[PDB]
Amino acid sequence: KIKLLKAAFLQYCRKDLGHAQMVVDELFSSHSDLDSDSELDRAVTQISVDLMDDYPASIILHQLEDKMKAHSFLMDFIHQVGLFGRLGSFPVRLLLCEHAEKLSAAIVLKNHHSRLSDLVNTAILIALNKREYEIPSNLTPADVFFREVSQVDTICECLLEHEEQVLRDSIEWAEVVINVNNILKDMLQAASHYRQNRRTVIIRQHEIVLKVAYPQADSNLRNIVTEQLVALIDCFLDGYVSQLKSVDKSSNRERYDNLEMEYLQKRSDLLSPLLSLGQYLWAASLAEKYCDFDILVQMCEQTDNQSRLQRYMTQFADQNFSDFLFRWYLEQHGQLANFLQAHEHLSWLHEINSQELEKAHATLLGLANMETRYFAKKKTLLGLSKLAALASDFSEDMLQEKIEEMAEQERFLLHQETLPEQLLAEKQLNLSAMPVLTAPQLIGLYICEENRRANEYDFKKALDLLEYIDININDLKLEILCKALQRDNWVSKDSIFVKILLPEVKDLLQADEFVLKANYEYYVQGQI
Amino acid sequence: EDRLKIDVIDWLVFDPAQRAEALKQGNAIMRKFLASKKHEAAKEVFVKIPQDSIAEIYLPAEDDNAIREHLCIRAYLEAHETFNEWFKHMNSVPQKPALIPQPTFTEKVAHEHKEKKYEMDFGIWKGHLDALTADVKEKMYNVLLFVDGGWMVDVREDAKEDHERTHQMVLLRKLCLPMLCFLLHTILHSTGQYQECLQLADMVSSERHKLYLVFSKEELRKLLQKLRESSLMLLDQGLDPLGYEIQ
């Protein structure tokens, strides 16, 4: 309650003179305190933060310096009396001390800068939040524009947009839009070095990137650079604060931590594109600031002839090589990087080039095997593999092996190759744009009732594709000998028994008839 | 001595009762000239052979082969007659309109027209080209895929020994089949038919023709550095090395 935060605010007053008495009101605190972590300890957090808000609410500068010392012997009179717990940062409101520190160094950084253009944008920013007492006392005020100065930044921006609507851009009007850029910048430089001594804020920064982009479209050279080294000074403080919040959160609830990554990653891409027109001399520092954002510094090295920069990038990197190759494929000296990118299935190419033929043959056969999507292509790869191997320097022995193990492949393929042209327009099949079929599909397609002119050779080859299997063998052995008779219209069965040269075929199982047994007699004399 | 030989043909052609000997000798003579690539020599002989010789002659092993050889030779010649026409055309592309920077308003309009006429000629020079490409290709596949036993390869196997001719027929295959392949590759590449270029490695390696035996190891690699070149242009188009969509 209010009686408590007015009792420690009374013990800090004595904590400047002596301690003994204050250390017994912190000792009466620990025994008389609640001590239930989850909210009563965030009831004394809501007290230490209500007194840091009042040492910030407190000769306007020497009086705000006296207040960064006061909130410094208030953070030392908490470390000692301790004050080693509580934290109710949650959403929107220990990090809260640092934050109120950082914004009191911001209040002294724009107190050190006092000119007629900012004092006007401030009076417009305070008359908009509420009215001011007109009993003189017109800074028009600060002690409350400190606890909340975050607001005099989003308003001294709306007073650079109405001073830009009248700017008529015209040169002196692009000098007033930079003077403000320089202050919001070194006010963000002052909060960074106060952390070294340890959605409106951000919108007003992505708003002045775009207005610092519209102006360099019309600007004397040198000026367009200083506002570019500035919007690079500022963008490098935003990307540093989204990096520090990432590192703050991890593990469980990851879904929210991989959705905030995509959001900062769609912005270091929107800050990169923006810098794609600008100077790339700053790219090296933007790429290092968000020390990866490689996709941007990798396409700046591509637009220029600096194959020296993309070698200096990969020289100092953790797995950029596996990144610059996968970032080349997704997208001259580009053929020297093609020489390295041809590492992987494009292998054979740089292998023919390197005169590494034997090698080209191994991978060309390997890609022929995995090949299942396109027949015409599985056929091409073997042919290439073969022409690679033949042109290579194998000993006549090894060569004879490569061309024999090969002759096999060509032997199976030839089957799908000789598929009649009657059933391939019947089945409405693409000539070449068809898949690498397997023994079954083939055997079953060579025997379809669609294949009309099916003759001795169609079945003979539909019995040659049985050693090309890897399910029921002798079920099919029957399926086919049976349509071998349906087509006979009780001549072909005759021939296929003439082509085989036998306890393969079945019998009683078959009838499952006058010349079937009749031919199965001069088939016991033939086999014998 | 060129004339001595091309002149002994008219003597054998004169007497129709020696047409079988006229053709056979015409073949031999044209086998020497082919090994020298004297195509106007070979053809000047090829016309002296009456266009109706084959019909009348109708078969000893020496006459079945000489009839086949003669057509093989015609298939070869026609594969150079149509290439030189095609090649002559490839080197007559309409030239871009000349630019007159800082033009008068007169020169501006003469140029709006010269630029519009050129954009009509370049379309036809692809038109005539396509028809000279479709034709020269066909001929190159008639020779490379010669029907019924390959080019300069006897079908009849019961003739009497003729080592000169036989080894002349093996040689002609090793001088002219590597050379026709490399041309067809140049035709396919020149017209941007890259997918098909790569399909020369099926035609060649094929066990149906065994064309790869007619190649020296060096010629092969050369054909393999020719195909890798077509492949590139297929990557530039966004397809895989062999021309198939990257899914």
| Share in helix of chain A | 40-55%
The multimeric state of the shown protein is: heterodimer
Instruction: Tally the beta strands of chain B.
Output: 0
Q: Indicate the CATH architecture of chain B.
A: Up-down Bundle
Radius of gyration of chain B from CA coordinates = 23 Å
Largest sheet of chain B: none
Separate helix tally of chain A: 31
Total helices of chain B: the number is: 10
Choose one word for the global shape of chain B. globular
Largest interface between protein chains, with number of residues from each side: A-B, 23 and 22 residues
Protein name (chain B): Nuclear pore complex protein Nup107
Subcellular location (chain B): Nucleus membrane; Nucleus, Nuclear pore complex; Chromosome, Centromere, Kinetochore
Family (chain B): Belongs to the nucleoporin Nup84/Nup107 family.
Organism (chain B): Homo sapiens (Human)
What does this protein structure show overall?
With 528 residues, chain A is mainly α. Chain A has one domain. In chain A, 48% of the residues lie in helices and 0% in strands. Chain A contains 31 helices and no strands. In chain A, helix 23 packs antiparallel against helix 24. The longest helix of chain A has 22 residues. Chain B has 247 residues and is mainly α. Chain B has one domain: Delta-Endotoxin, domain 1 (Up-down Bundle). Chain B is built from 10 helices and no strands. Chain B is 70% helix and 0% strand. The longest helix of chain B has 40 residues. The radius of gyration of chain B is 23 Å and the shape is globular. At the A-B interface, helix 21 and helix 23 of A face helix 9 and helix 10 of B. It is classed as protein transport. The entry lists the keywords protein transport, Phosphoprotein.
